[PDB]
């Protein structure tokens, strides 16, 4: 239907257009690659103005019609799902491979010959990442934890967090430790909940071994904690979706009252029901009741008088988060409560955060947990957002380091090692393939050059120094002076990347380049 | 192809300019308003019927729409200054724009990567901040001279406002209001009452924490040894917080029986309240003649319609509690004061307190020609009280009139003596931006800004780093003899906020706007 | 040579500001003086008016320019504080702006100009005070002469011998000797057709525009009365919502009619229980103030009713009589009632005017009403207009005691004084003061032009004559030349000249400070 | 949520919101049948997997 | 990123110089070698000439751009000094300009 | 004095344009070389200058980079007077062309 008003590209001209379009869009985030990269202003569909250098946010904000550029977006999604540390690098590298493909096509190298050459060249690069890697966990627990903190501290040094990276580094590493076993070494980032609130500064951020509800137990005269009940199994809580009150109408009462007598009877009926519910909740062995909805005035009066604290207005997901922390279940009715579904925790108390008056309600496990909360503070919305994202990046690094102990130094160091390795092997191809292998090495150079240029360095003088040091003397962890040091040693600077990170970055970036090169015909219709 | 579906992008080739031009254009909105001799702008909506004149930086920046997202960045930062500090808003906006203005030159002519400009600005900022500390002088001892510093601080912040004509009077009103506290910086303990009629020079300070809403139809006009209980409850009827209830009757006589039952509730309700041991009762809700008479018979004042300001103001000075629950007596906090009076001020009733628990609170009462003069006077005192409160906790001050700015630029130029090459140009740019603030001051005052600032440069360089601009005579004067001083913390805030504001814009190289929703 | 470039050109705004404002001032300028010229204005609604009233001209001028409109506020402030000189203050402002334009062309910063002009204005005020011929508000003849003089330009001047002392007593009732600021809003002028100009009364109570009971049996006059203010409407129930009633027999309709009558009566009876003698009902457009049937019932209760009383009249009743507004029917109680010895309707050639007099209570407040009568509308309108001016002139004499000769006399004297005093000044202030003194001459220049006299000749004669005289020499349109301002009775209250100097200076200050305009939406 | 807690206490496994294609493939693999209601269920509606 | 504003653009002249010069070299390039392709030129007199001789072609190409003409002088220098390679010295010039 | 202060500094800014142009023409980063050179001459070491072959800062006495005193006097003298000639001009008046 509607053959007209369509666009079509094919053949040699499509190959030039596809690469040049990929370059134009990929170039957008060139300046995001590096700890000294630049920010961009992103305006939401509603007119809200934000500033970030987050590669994923920028690529997601870019809403474009060029189908080839959309493939670059899909690449970044894969890198985010697996590793998280290569959002920008895989696009920059893939673009460099496409740029090399352009010249290779112009010289008469068939796109298939280009795809095959790059693939085999990538195998050389990946081999070097494994041969030159090292192991962190091969020492002991004290150094292993220290190394995880050091890797986090380095990653946090490019963020607003830097003002107190010691606190956030501990938040990231401890958050992982609390939800993993040393022998299993399976870390699931979904077990670490991110949370923050505008106010104070990032220096007030804290890791909570539990969940935050930020509630006042439903009355200012209610005790600020739930007692351990003379050595019981910690504190037991009820999780209800029905509020601790008789159901109310959704519109108006319209309950005829002929005199004060019937009014008092209505009050009495509620007060008697509130007592009945108090008895049932306590007989269940519950100390505090958390409900999805709020409470009536009479509810708070009877709950206070009988010393039965209750938590108000905790949302659906938040109620499940309580259950996950406390190994409980969400119960639809107060009458269905029993010791087997009531949640167990170490303590339930209000936690003060310096002079902060929120005094947020926390349910704490004080042990291995199914969830932790990483609470982030900051002096503005974007500070909390960036600081929260900073922990996410650190958690991605720590998670990857725990799962696979093998690490490489990727701050432009591994890239030069791999570039030299492919370049030296390219001479051995003795055939047409030499064109693609040499191009592949040149594509790899794009990364340490981009890291240099984004930092205010001459990318050509820098790369020459890096290759000379690794070639003339010995291959070592010699990278780009992005953070600022007296030399290029990435071990003294402590810039460490996971092995599985650099491996997947090249493999996925190569696959993307091949995906675009493999397309010889694009047909675009309208939008219905 | 690239972006579509109403997406807009400015690529680095042009955004490298917008990132500067936008925020710089923001400076143009307030640069003319800086100083006691600043100039005014008009604001007008499309309706033409809202035409107003103002020199208030925050008003101008918030009122004028911006089309450049980069411009909006600086205004949002400047807002934070206005909310968190309460002064220096214009100085941050102007200095931030000038820091970016010179940085644009460092891109245009010097070809310096933004990363080097930012790093240089950070080092230059440290030099400027160190200069403020070294030049900071306190009078922590001899509180007699400390009070004098507060008066000069009061006049400096009050200047350029509607109260600048009468600052010799309002400086003492603001100073006494804060000096009375010698303690907490919480401005809630100082209220401003806006009364029409008379001159602003007639403003008084009254420790009685005057409240502007009368109570009662016929109640005692003076109570001694009062216990204060505040409420939010219905005392007019039963069926409290029940909505939609009706009473079906076959006669008005039966309806009267309902009203009699309501009175039965009111009698019991007032009795239970009276068992708290109170002398004045404040209800956020209305109090009808019946519950009023029930209170009156007991000697208890009945205050009705105590809205948000009513409860918060009265609760604060009396030290009481809103008490939403009255089920049992003596289960809440009561306030206390020695005397409550009904007083007529300008032939209008007010509530006057005396002898309140921890009665450090006070009010300043304004007497204005019209609402505009009262609203401007109210905000003018608010700004001065905020800065004065900060000087209560931070007793160090610095010299104003451009002195602190020139002294900082001296240190910044000194820092560039021993620094990397391209960073030197960034540091020099920082110093040049600092010297623009005293240039704007001299310019707006109508003086030869080039002669005045250039002479100030020589004066501050060749010793005697006490001099600054005399913006009344158009010459150079000793700021300590002239009496122009500014809070140390305030001046630090201006340098810190402006430095960060520049960095935020310097890091921008692209603008992307998603499809409108 | 070469000087500052100022790439950004805020001077373009300052030029547009002065140009627009001076154009307005030059327009109104031609209307100055008893011989001034009239203007024709076609309004946006198509109605065409002819007037020489300064304020009316500016109001209907439909000024758009964001700054020029300031001159309208100037004329409002002049009318609010002084009540006269609304043309002169605008003309002076224009001339001072012209002086500012020349000063700006000489390179004088607008901040310098504004500050120096303010200093010159302060000296002008002192000079005006020195020139004052002091009067006392206890001397009725001084006040009557001042009022009658200002009324000499009215259509009917002969009755000022009676309207002037009425204005004096009206002000003195509220302007006791130990006072300065007199608020004339406490003097209500109530007019009806009928009678003649002499038939005018100063009343120590509140006079209304509305009639008493129209229905048979109404007392229409009460003695020793308690007076209530009704804000609710006494009318049969008429809900605004949907109602469905089925009537199958006349007996049901009779019950409906009884409901309408009983409702009105039930209100009437509840009102009487409050011991209220006179009902003064606020006008509303929601329902009729009082139904004809309610007047019948209230008449049977011997209650006097005055319906459809204007909101402003209610404000006067609630201040004078001690009575209070009554929001609702159940709230109608004795505590809300005022006091008066006699409430009556007076029919003078069909005037049908209600008067409340004789408060005789501590709740009395210094409120004044005036009863204006006259056969034709033009008679009561000219009486009201004359009293409005007379009250303003007398108010001026209380606030700033004394009169200064008119005809440009203080403008020539102040200009000469400042021209000589400027010789003691240095720098920009000396030059600006000379420009200020020159700007003052716009008034005696304009007066000479509008009077048909040679401009330079008249101004020159005045400047030379003020070598020996001070306030005695000025322009008289009656004598068509420079003559004795006192013998010709050309006198203006100090407040009027003082206000013109102050407000004109404040306007110029405000205009010169405008360097920009931005939209805000 | 209630249904799955009820069924879980009965040691019964639930999976809802399953696409029409996936539902058919399950029933077609185990030999059962889909019934709209709960009151009309027959034992021949049940299937079995190894 | 943000870099040199490049308000004054001297690169515009060098780009025009390289583009014009490389165009001349590419025109000669296709005639290189015993198997090269012939060039046909219509002269200002209307005559049609056909040749694969680089130098003869260059003289008749009537190059206008002041800098591109310098590639003709290069072939003259080769013809004067060596007498051979007159096509190859311009072709190498074009490729090196591309570098 | 105040008014003349900026003119004196402007003169210095003009003087330092020559080493900027020298570096730029040599294809080097003039912003780095000139800024660093100034810091060298400022903090004593008044022997240093541009090495327009290696792209660095070098001791001119060791390299042998010298210029005649008389010529430098002529260059400064001529440049100063040359500016003054046009600084004194603010109007251009032409007679009828022939």
Instruction: Tell me the three state secondary structure of residue C374.
Output: strand
Integer Cα distance of C401 and C410 in angstroms:
16
* Burial class for B151, CB neighbours closer than 10 Å (0-12, 13-18, 19+): buried
B-chain residues near A386 (CB < 8 A) = none
In this complex, is the C-beta atom of E1 within 8 Å of any C-beta atom belonging to chain A? Answer: yes
Instruction: Tell me the three state secondary structure of residue A331.
Output: strand
Give yes or no: residues A349 and A224 share one domain: yes
Q: CB–CB of B420 and F36 under 8 A?
A: yes
Q: Which residue has the tokens 């003054």?
A: F84
Strand partners, F13: none
Q: Which of C111, C335, C519 is nearest residue B44 as measured by Cβ atoms?
A: C519
Give yes or no: residues A436 and A450 share one domain: yes
Cα of E8 to nearest chain B Cα, Å:
10
Give yes or no: residues A214 and A358 share one domain: yes
Instruction: Tell me the three state secondary structure of residue B367.
Output: strand
Integer Cα distance of A132 and A414 in angstroms:
9
Phi-psi map region of B204: left, alpha, beta (phi>0 left; psi -120 to 50 alpha): beta
Touching pair D, F by Cβ (3+ pairs < 8 Å)? no
Going by the DSSP 8-state scheme, the letter that residue A247 receives in this structure is -
Nearest to A413 by CA among A477, A482, A459: A477
For residue C120, what is the enclosing H or E element?
helix C110-130
Of A386, A405, A424, the one marking the end of a domain is A405
In this complex, is the C-beta atom of A20 within 8 Å of any C-beta atom belonging to chain B? Answer: no
- Per the CB < 8 A criterion, the answer to whether A401 and A177 are in contact is no
Integer Cα distance of C230 and B305 in angstroms:
24
Domains of chain B in start order, with CATH, are 1-138+395-517 (1.10.560.10), 139-215+350-394 (3.30.260.10), 216-349 (3.50.7.10)
In this complex, is the C-beta atom of A150 within 8 Å of any C-beta atom belonging to chain B? Answer: no
Q: Which of B417, B452, B454 is nearest residue F43 as measured by Cβ atoms?
A: B417
* Burial class for B415, CB neighbours closer than 10 Å (0-12, 13-18, 19+): buried
Give yes or no: residues A239 and A338 share one domain: yes
Cα of C201 to nearest chain B Cα, Å:
30
Nearest to A328 by CA among A380, A289, A375: A289
Q: Which of C93, C200, C357, C389 is catalytic?
A: C389
Instruction: Identify whether A88 is a catalytic site residue.
Output: yes
- Which residues does B contribute to its contact with F (CB < 8 Å)? 110-112, 417-422, 424-425, 450-455, 457-458
Integer Cα distance of B194 and B203 in angstroms:
10
B-chain residues near E7 (CB < 8 A) = 108
Integer Cα distance of A44 and A34 in angstroms:
25
Instruction: Identify whether C53 is a catalytic site residue.
Output: yes
B-chain residues near C112 (CB < 8 A) = 446
Q: Which of B421, B422, B454 is nearest residue F3 as measured by Cβ atoms?
A: B454
Give yes or no: residues A254 and A363 share one domain: yes
Going by the DSSP 8-state scheme, the letter that residue F16 receives in this structure is T
Between the CA of residue A357 and those of A200, A214, B132, what are the distances in Å? 11, 11, 33
Going by the DSSP 8-state scheme, the letter that residue B37 receives in this structure is T
Q: Which of B17, B108, B113 is nearest residue E1 as measured by Cβ atoms?
A: B113
Integer Cα distance of A208 and A197 in angstroms:
14
Q: Which residue has the tokens 């739930």?
A: A226
Of A356, A389, A405, the one marking the end of a domain is A405
Integer Cα distance of B45 and B323 in angstroms:
45
SS3 of C71-114: HHHHHHHHHHHCCCCCCHHHHHHHHHHHHHHHHHHCCCCHHHHH
Of A378, A405, A432, the one marking the end of a domain is A405
Integer Cα distance of C37 and C451 in angstroms:
10
* Mutation for testing the C interface, residue in B34, B35, B39 having most C CBs under 10 Å: B39
Instruction: Tell me the three state secondary structure of residue C320.
Output: helix
Nearest to A439 by CA among A93, A200, A69: A93
Cα of A38 to nearest chain E Cα, Å:
7
Give yes or no: residues A460 and A516 share one domain: yes
* Mutation for testing the C interface, residue in B33, B41, B55, B472 having most C CBs under 10 Å: B41
Cα of A126 to nearest chain D Cα, Å:
40
Instruction: Identify whether C56 is a catalytic site residue.
Output: no
Between the CA of residue F69 and those of F66, F72, F75, F76, what are the distances in Å? 9, 5, 10, 11
Integer Cα distance of A176 and C350 in angstroms:
98
Nearest to C279 by CA among C335, C217, C325: C325
Give yes or no: residues A57 and A178 share one domain: no
Going by the DSSP 8-state scheme, the letter that residue C50 receives in this structure is E
Transcribe B484-495 into DSSP letters: -EEEHHHHHHHH
For residue A375, what is the enclosing H or E element?
strand A372-376
Give yes or no: residues A218 and A364 share one domain: yes
Give yes or no: residues A91 and A106 share one domain: yes
Task: Give residue A135's Cα distance to chain centre.
Answer: 24
Instruction: Identify whether C389 is a catalytic site residue.
Output: yes
B-chain residues near A259 (CB < 8 A) = 257-258, 261
Give yes or no: residues A103 and A144 share one domain: no
Domain that holds residue A152: 137-209+370-405
Give yes or no: residues A273 and A175 share one domain: no
Integer Cα distance of A195 and A373 in angstroms:
7
Integer Cα distance of B488 and B478 in angstroms:
18
Q: Which of A393, A404, A433, A489 is catalytic?
A: A393
Between the CA of residue B413 and those of B418, B427, D21, E92, what are the distances in Å? 10, 7, 75, 54
Nearest to C56 by CA among C80, C35, C34, C40: C40
Integer Cα distance of A199 and A211 in angstroms:
20
C-chain residues near B50 (CB < 8 A) = 520
Integer Cα distance of A457 and E97 in angstroms:
27
Give yes or no: residues A216 and A362 share one domain: yes
CATH fold of C203-399 reads GroEL (3.50.7)
Number of domains making up chain A: 3
Q: Torsion angle of alpha carbons A315, A319, A324, A325, nearest 10°?
A: 100
List, in order, residues 6 or more apart from C314 with CB less than 8 Å away: C229, C231, C280, C282, C325
Q: Which of A54, A99, A445, A497 is catalytic?
A: A54
C-chain residues near B445 (CB < 8 A) = 111
List, in order, residues 6 or more apart from B422 with CB less than 8 Å away: B110, B112, B116, B120, F31, F32, F35
Integer Cα distance of B441 and F52 in angstroms:
45
């Amino acid at each position: 239907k509607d053959q007209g008003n369509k666009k079509r590209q094919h053949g040699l001209e499509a190959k030039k257009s596809h690469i040049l379009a990929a370059r134009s869009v990929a170039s957008i985030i060139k300046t995001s690659l590096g700890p000294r990269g630049l920010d961009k202003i992103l305006i939401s569909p509603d007119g809200e103005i934000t500033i970030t250098n987050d590669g994923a946010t920028i690529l997601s904000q870019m809403e474009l019609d060029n189908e080839i550029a959309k493939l670059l977006v899909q690449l970044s999604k894969s890198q985010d799902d697996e590793i998280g540390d290569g959002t920008t690098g895989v696009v920059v590298l893939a673009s460099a491979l496409l740029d090399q493909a352009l010249e290779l096509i112009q010289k008469g190298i068939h796109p298939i010959k280009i795809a095959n050459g790059f693939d085999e060249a990538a195998k050389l690069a990946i081999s070097k990442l494994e041969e030159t890697c090292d192991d962190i966990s091969a020492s002991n627990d004290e150094l292993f934890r220290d190394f995880l903190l050091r890797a986090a501290k380095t990653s946090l040094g490019s963020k607003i967090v830097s003002k107190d990276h010691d606190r956030f580094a501990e938040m990231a590493v401890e958050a992982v430790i609390n939800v993993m076993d040393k022998d299993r070494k399976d870390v699931d980032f979904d077990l670490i909940k991110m949370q923050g609130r505008v106010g104070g500064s990032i220096s007030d951020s804290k890791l909570i071994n539990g969940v935050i509800l930020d509630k006042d137990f439903s009355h200012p005269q209610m005790p600020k904690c739930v007692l351990p009940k003379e050595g019981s199994d910690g504190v037991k809580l009820a999780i209800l979706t029905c509020p601790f009150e008789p159901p109310k109408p959704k519109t108006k009462h319209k309950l005829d009252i002929s005199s004060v007598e019937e009014y008092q009877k209505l009050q009495t009926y509620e007060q008697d029901k509130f007592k009945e519910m108090i008895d049932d909740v306590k007989k269940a062995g519950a100390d505090v009741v958390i409900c999805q909805w709020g409470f009536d005035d009479e509810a708070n009066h009877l709950l206070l008088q009988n010393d039965l604290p209750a938590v108000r207005w905790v949302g659906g997901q938040e109620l499940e988060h309580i259950a996950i922390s406390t190994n409980g279940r969400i119960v639809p009715r107060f009458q269905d409560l029993s010791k087997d579904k009531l949640g167990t925790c170490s303590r339930i108390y209000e936690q003060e955060f310096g002079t902060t008056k929120d005094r947020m309600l926390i349910i704490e496990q004080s042990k291995e947990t199914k969830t932790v909360t990483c609470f982030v503070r900051g002096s503005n919305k974007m500070i909390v957002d960036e600081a929260e994202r900073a922990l996410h990046d650190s958690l991605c690094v720590v998670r990857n380091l725990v799962k696979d102990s093998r690490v490489v130094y990727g701050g432009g160091a591994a890239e030069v090692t791999m570039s030299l390795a492919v370049s030296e092997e390219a001479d051995k191809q003795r055939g047409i393939d030499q064109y693609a292998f040499r191009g592949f090495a040149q594509a790899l150079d794009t990364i340490p050059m981009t890291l240099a240029e984004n930092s205010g360095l001459d990318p050509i003088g820098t790369l020459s120094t890096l290759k000379s040091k690794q070639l003339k003397e010995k291959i070592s962890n010699i990278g780009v002076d992005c953070l600022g040091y007296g030399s290029n040693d990435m071990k003294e600077l402590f810039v460490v990347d996971p092995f599985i990170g650099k491996k997947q970055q090249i493999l996925l970036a190569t696959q993307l380049c091949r995906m675009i090169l493999k397309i010889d015909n694009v047909i675009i219709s309208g939008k219905d | 192809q690239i972006f579509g579906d109403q997406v807009t992008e400015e690529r680095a080739e042009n955004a490298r300019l917008s990132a500067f031009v936008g925020a710089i254009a923001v400076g143009d909105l307030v640069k003319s308003t800086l100083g006691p001799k600043g100039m005014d702008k008009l604001l007008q909506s499309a309706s033409s019927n809202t035409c107003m004149v103002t020199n208030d930086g925050a008003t101008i920046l918030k009122s004028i729409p911006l089309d450049n997202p980069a411009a909006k960045v600086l205004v949002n930062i400047s807002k934070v200054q206005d909310d968190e500090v309460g002064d220096g808003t214009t100085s941050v906006t102007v200095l931030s724009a000038e820091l970016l203005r010179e940085a644009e030159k460092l891109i245009d002519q010097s070809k310096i990567h933004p990363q080097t400009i930012i790093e240089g600005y950070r080092l230059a900022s440290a030099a400027a901040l160190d200069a403020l500390t070294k030049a900071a002088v306190d009078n922590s001892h001899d509180k007699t001279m400390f009070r004098e510093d507060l008066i000069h601080i009061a006049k400096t912040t009050l200047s350029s406002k509607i109260l600048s004509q009468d600052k010799d009077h309002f400086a003492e009103l603001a100073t006494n209001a804060i000096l009375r506290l010698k303690g907490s910086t919480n401005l809630e303990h100082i209220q401003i009452i806006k009364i029409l009629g008379g001159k602003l020079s007639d403003s008084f300070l009254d420790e009685g924490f005057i409240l502007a809403k009368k109570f009662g139809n016929n109640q005692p006009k003076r109570i001694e040894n009062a216990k204060i209980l505040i409420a939010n409850t219905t005392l007019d009827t039963d069926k409290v917080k029940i909505f939609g209830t009706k009473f079906k009757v076959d006669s008005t006589a039966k309806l009267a029986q309902l009203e009699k039952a309501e009175r039965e509730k009111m009698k019991n309700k007032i009795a239970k309240i009276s068992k708290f041991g109170i002398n004045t009762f404040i209800n956020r809700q209305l109090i009808y003649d019946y519950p009023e008479q029930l209170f009156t018979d007991l000697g208890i004042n009945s205050i009705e319609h105590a809205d948000f300001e009513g409860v918060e103001r009265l609760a604060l000075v009396t030290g009481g509690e809103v008490v939403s629950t009255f089920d049992e007596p003596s289960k809440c906090k009561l306030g206390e004061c020695d005397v409550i009076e009904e007083i007529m001020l300008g032939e209008q009733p007010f509530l006057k307190f005396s002898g309140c628990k921890a009665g450090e609170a006070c009010t300043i009462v304004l007497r204005g020609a019209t609402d505009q003069t009262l609203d401007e006077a109210e905000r003018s005192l608010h700004d001065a009280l905020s800065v004065l409160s900060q000087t209560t906790k931070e007793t160090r001050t610095v010299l104003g009139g451009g002195c602190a700015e020139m002294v900082m630029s001296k240190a910044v130029d000194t820092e560039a003596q021993n620094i990397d090459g391209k960073k030197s140009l960034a540091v020099e740019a920082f110093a040049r931006a600092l010297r623009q603030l005293p240039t704007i001051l001299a310019d707006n005052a109508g003086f030869d800004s080039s002669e005045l600032v250039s002479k100030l440069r020589s004066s501050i360089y060749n010793g005697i780093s006490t001099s600054g601009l005399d913006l009344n005579n158009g010459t150079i004067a000793d700021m300590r003899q002239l009496g122009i001083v500014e809070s140390y913390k305030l001046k630090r805030a201006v340098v810190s906020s402006a430095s960060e504001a520049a960095e935020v814009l310097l890091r921008v190289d692209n603008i992307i706007r998603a499809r409108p929703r | 040579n070469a000087t500052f470039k100022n790439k950004e050109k805020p001077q373009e705004v300052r030029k547009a500001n002065i140009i627009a404002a001076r154009s307005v001032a030059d327009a109104i300028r031609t209307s100055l003086g008893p011989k001034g010229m009239d203007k024709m204005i076609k309004t946006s609604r198509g109605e065409i008016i002819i007037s020489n009233d300064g304020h009316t001209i500016l109001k209907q001028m439909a000024i758009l320019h964001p700054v020029a409109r300031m001159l309208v506020e100037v004329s409002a402030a002049q009318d609010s504080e002084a009540g006269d000189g609304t043309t002169s203050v605008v003309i002076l402002t224009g001339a001072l702006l012209g002086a500012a334009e020349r000063l700006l062309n000489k390179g004088i910063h607008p901040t310098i100009i504004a500050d120096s002009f303010q200093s010159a204005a302060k000296r002008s005020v002192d000079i005006l005070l020195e020139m004052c011929h002091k009067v006392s508000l206890s001397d009725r003849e001084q006040l009557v002469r001042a009022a009658s003089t200002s009324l000499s330009s009215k259509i009917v001047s002969q009755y000022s011998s009676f309207l002037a002392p009425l204005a004096v007593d009206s002000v003195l009732k509220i302007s006791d000797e130990n006072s300065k600021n007199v608020d004339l809003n406490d003097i209500r002028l109530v007019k009806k057709v009928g009678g003649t100009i002499d038939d005018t009364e100063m009343i120590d109570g509140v006079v209304l525009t509305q009639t008493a009971i129209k229905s048979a049996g109404g007392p229409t006059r009460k003695e020793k009365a308690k007076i209530g203010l009704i804000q609710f409407q006494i009318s049969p129930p008429k809900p605004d919502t949907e109602n469905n009633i089925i009537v199958n027999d006349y007996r049901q309709m009779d019950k409906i009619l009884k409901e309408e009558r009983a409702y009105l009566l039930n209100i009437c009876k509840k009102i009487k229980k409050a011991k209220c003698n006179v009902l003064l009902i606020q006008k509303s457009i929601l329902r009729d103030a009082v139904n004809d049937l309610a007047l019948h019932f209230l008449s049977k209760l011997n209650i006097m009713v005055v319906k459809d009383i204007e909101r402003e009249e209610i404000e006067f009743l609630s201040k004078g009589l001690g009575c209070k507004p009554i929001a609702d029917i159940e709230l109608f109680t004795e505590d809300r009632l005022g006091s008066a010895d006699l409430v009556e309707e007076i029919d003078s050639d069909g005037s049908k005017i209600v008067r409340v007099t004789g408060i005789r209570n501590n709740n009395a407040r210094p409120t004044v009403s005036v009863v204006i009568r006259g056969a034709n509308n033009m008679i009561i309108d000219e009486t009201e207009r004359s009293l409005h001016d007379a009250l303003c002139v007398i108010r001026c004499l209380v606030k700033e005691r004394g009169l200064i000769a008119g005809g440009g006399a203080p403008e020539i004297e102040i200009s000469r004084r400042l021209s000589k005093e400027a010789r003691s000044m240095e720098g920009v202030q000396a030059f600006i003061w000379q420009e200020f003194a020159s700007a003052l001459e716009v008034i005696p220049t304009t007066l000479a032009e509008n009077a048909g006299l040679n401009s330079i000749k008249v101004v020159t004669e005045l400047r030379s004559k003020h070598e020996n005289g001070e306030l005695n020499d000025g322009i008289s349109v009656r004598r068509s030349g420079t003559t004795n301002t006192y013998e010709e009775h050309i006198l203006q209250p100090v407040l009027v000249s003082t206000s013109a100097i102050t407000l004109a200076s404040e306007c110029v200050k405000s205009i010169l400070r405008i360097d920009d305009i931005a939209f805000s939406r | 949520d209630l249904a799955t807690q009820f069924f879980a206490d009965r040691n019964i496994f639930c999976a809802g919101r399953v696409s029409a294609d996936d539902m058919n493939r399950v029933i077609q693999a185990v030999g059962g049948s889909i019934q709209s209601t709960t009151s009309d269920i027959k034992p021949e509606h049940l299937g079995t997997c190894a």
